[PDB]
Symmetry: D2
Subunit: 305 residues, 4 copies
């Protein structure tokens, strides 16, 4: 198996707090927050650790929040490589409401990155050995032009770095601009936005995914379909894998868990079918903070029936 | 093709209205109601009509609301057979909230049936010829014992009427009490209650469905799974059908549409696979717009599922 | 004291039901409804009965719902005079949500009235003896043109019937069109709509109310101000009465209770001050289905300190 | 006019953001935060500035967030006196929901203060000269004993600093423990808890307020009543002031504005009536827009109340 790294341009120190009620106008008294590592590539790395593998998380860190984010990851035994940033690591807020048992997630943009920090992030990435896998996951923070994302991925690819991309909107297009991307995991929304047309017909998602493979923009496209699972596309195969008929308790961390699972499968040179199954297994395991090894194992064995 | 009848012991004259915002305390000013046919078996009969089929809807009807329910179905070319009830046909409320674009459905019990009005309904049911299909769908209204429902199904079965059941709670249990139902469509919640245990493992739903078949309660169990489609089970077969990757705009009224589709397939003696696929096609067709499934959407999805 | 009658052009059989949760999309299973008399003039009459007086409620009734509405009022010992209508008496739905303890009120328009029923309603009103008081309260149902409301009030007034009006929007203007109205109780919204300008300045409400008295459109204008009470205006006096600093548990039935109280005071030829105080007392008592005699008494004694 | 100082043991760097809709489960995408000064005594000092007065805000500040809180107040010409804390200044979240136009405020505890950082804050407080006014407003942060707050008020009083208190829970009780507070502004909830009983009768709030005065805990009790205005109580007087019949757009941050107004009146030795009227004027001025009271709106309302 090859080495795995992730990149999170917009990391977060996520604070989880509780309040009895949610209602407008008044003050909602919240408990003192419990902190946790936030960000796409970061969660992908944590999911990989849950699933037994190892992934180095690359990201910018600033202020005492950044230091706290780095310290959480140390406690969870996830390797990191950071560049210090001027703007302090931002905080997303997850609020649990007692009276309903429900969660609310307020996701702000990440901290800003100036030209210089991005170049430091690029230097760190180009340190990755050839053949190794890099998962670029999450949104694009303020201060980064889309052309700079494209240049990073080209640069990485020019020296044998295998690139996996999970992102949104123009950031996704910027990633696929150069092409030869190893793996992309848009959900439905991200797919419709990337292709710029509504996906209203039964075969629309498949045709759109197949187009991306055929145009060479990506070697593999896995479209995640929430409860319906995921549809995966090669130059060779096309496959849909549906999760077990089991009730979902939350949505949090499904995408990143799936991406981590599929990354571990890609690194192991598994078949397209193995990869999507393991991805759906981990994605759905997370819906039962992320995916556990035993839950993923159970679901993967069932799909592998 | 055999004849198809549906039974709705608790029909409804539902009102669809629009209000700008939803919030407690204040008066929520609602637009003039737009009336629509309500009830399980009624909507199964409406879906069958849309799918180019035909089914006679048997239901009680009382008062000006009863008359408007009947007249609504007349305008839809849905054949009916009604019994006049003393208590007025009830009205559930469907509220569209402009601000969020959301819909709320407030579902109240059906009007009461006295024992005479029930007797007339069973009499209409027992006029159905042997070999024809009867779909019993929806909740049980006040004034009817559970035993009355079981006795009705036993009597109909005794004269060769093939029964399809869609219900919940204690009513679903009692429909399955004497067994030999042709087809039941529980969702995940209804299957769990029916079998009286948690379905949390990957293979539980399938096993729960098979258990109902092996016990003789039903020849066919199709567990509907919302966006995950459906898991259909036979004495010989088991198939899951997943709908196409198209997002849904609503959930009303997907269960009834599916049941309408599968009843039609049953009337055609189609294989289990075709029944379930056509079920998912119609159900998912109904989710495509915020009343039921249409012929063309269903055909489109079914052809995709059959490819 | 003179005799009191009310008129409700848009009556309602209100059904109150309970559900554990309120949420979009799914089916909200509601208990079998508990029915209660709905409509402005109807509630005004019930409030008058609670406060010891007697008021005859005039309204159209149709279908089994109308019959049920009539039967509820019989049980509460409120006199009625009905005309039978073709369109069945409509049902507004009040939903109590267990998980929050909150109420939601869905108010549809009343049943339609054709030309003929309205004339029957007019005939019933013109049967009222001269000098007696008629409270016209509530919204205008489908099938009634605003000119017909105006004609009814003129007709009533032409033969000594004392008219009190509580309504909304154009219906309110239609009422004041003829002028010499005994008493109007707009709230803030209704006042701003009646006068057609935003009431943004401190003295705006008073000036607007005073204008109506001075123009002769109404002998008395009481603007209700929710928790701030009510501001009442004569040709002579101008007075604001504020409720006791007591927490409010619900809003339901505040306006109608206030109007009933003030009607009883008007019938007793009380001063403007007595009238508004008793109105605020009953209005606020209701916020603690309507106003109780003891609660109103308590608050009225406090205001009368 | 004497000098005015405020104390905020739990200041905040609050972020105001906008999201289209609010609902559980999904990610609620929020716009880039817009930062604003948070904290009781800070906002009292900001309101005083708006009202054309001057007050020095004493508070702890840590990290880049602390620096931005300080810089925000600099841009507002609010004099400050800060103590550097180790733990970073916290951030509450204010969320504007476009769909409904509503605002949600998620209010978390202030950053911790160690005993040394508290010592420095008291040292800054005790540099205030006799006869000057100190407003202690807001919650108590972690790491501070209730006794530390009481000792601070006793020490300040001992050297002639006139103290105004706005707080809640156990902190408010302890501020009133040694008595002789110049002015406390509880709302209805805070008054009820403070006196530890239900205020349900018409005359209860007034009696509760008078009880606090007669006990010596405070010379002036002004109970704020939301839209009903305020009930101010003295050893000699009692006055309720109701705001004008103008609807409010927000409730943020009406309490602090009122306190700022009344502090200014106290510094002018105005009668109780003028203090309360000016209090309601500023408080209600702040409710006129969705940050605090403005000079012109306050003047307008006060002139109306004084007519
Ligand atoms: N409601 C659900 N029930 C069962 N499995 C689910 C459910 N939602 C997501 N999953 C599993 O997680 C995988 C990824 O989730 P999803 O399709 O929603 O991608 P995503 O939207 O990018 O996730 P995220 O919103 O966290 O970034 C799915 O393929 C599926 O296997
Ligand atoms: N969110 C969805 N996305 C795609 N298809 C759906 C969705 N929800 C329902 N369907 C289709 O409709 C069929 C029946 O719906 P469902 O599984 O929710 O049964 P149900 O709960 O009895 O419906 P109902 O609440 O109307 O009685 C499903 O099998 C599926 O084919
Ligand atoms: N929140 C409250 N707290 C104390 N008293 C209240 C409150 N709301 C209403 N009242 C009392 O009830 C009286 C009438 O209520 P209001 O001003 O809201 O008129 P309204 O809006 O026409 O009532 P409704 O919405 O029921 O038709 C007020 O003058 C006041 O005395
Ligand atoms: N809804 C309103 N309408 C008119 N004026 C208001 C309203 N709410 C508050 N005010 C004004 O602001 C003053 C203080 O507000 P309030 O009574 O709610 O105290 P508070 O609860 O401590 O405020 P805060 O929650 O900001 O600490 C009130 O006395 C009143 O003058
Ligand atoms: Mg408040
Ligand atoms: Mg999603
Ligand atoms: Mg994702
Ligand atoms: Mg169903
Ligand atoms: Mg359902
Ligand atoms: Mg109102
Ligand atoms: Mg009213
Ligand atoms: Mg306060």
């Amino acid at each position: 198996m090859v080495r795995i790294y992730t990149l999170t341009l917009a990391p977060s120190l996520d604070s989880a707090t509780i309040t009895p009620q949610i209602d407008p106008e008044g003050k909602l008294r919240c408990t003192a927050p419990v902190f946790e590592p936030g960000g796409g590539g970061i969660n992908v790395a944590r999911a990989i650790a849950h699933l037994g593998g190892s992934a180095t998380a690359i990201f910018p860190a600033g202020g005492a929040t950044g230091e706290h984010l780095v310290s959480l990851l140390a406690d969870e035994n996830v390797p990191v490589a950071t560049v210090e940033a001027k703007d302090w690591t931002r905080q997303n807020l997850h609020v649990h409401v007692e009276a309903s048992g429900e969660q609310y997630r307020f996701v702000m943009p990440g901290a800003a990155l100036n030209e210089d920090e991005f170049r430091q992030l690029e230097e760190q990435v180009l340190e990755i050995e050839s053949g190794a896998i890099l998962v670029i996951s999450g949104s694009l923070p303020p201060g980064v032009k889309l052309e700079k994302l494209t240049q990073l991925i080209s640069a990485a690819q020019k020296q044998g770095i295998r690139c996996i991309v999970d992102s949104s909107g123009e950031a996704l297009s910027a990633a696929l601009a150069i092409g030869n991307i190893e793996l992309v995991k848009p959900n439905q929304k991200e797919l419709s936005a990337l292709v710029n047309r509504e996906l209203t017909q039964p075969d629309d998602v498949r045709k759109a995914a197949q187009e991306i493979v055929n145009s060479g923009k990506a070697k593999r496209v896995v479209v995640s379909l929430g409860p319906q699972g995921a549809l995966g596309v090669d130059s060779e195969n096309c496959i849909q894998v549906v999760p077990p008929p089991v009730k979902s308790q939350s949505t949090v961390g499904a995408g990143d868990s799936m991406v981590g699972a599929m990354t571990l499968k890609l690194a192991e040179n598994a078949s397209l079918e193995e990869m999507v199954r393991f991805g759906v297994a981990a994605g759905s395991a997370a819906t039962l903070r992320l995916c556990s090894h035993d839950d993923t194992q159970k679901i993967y064995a069932y799909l592998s029936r």
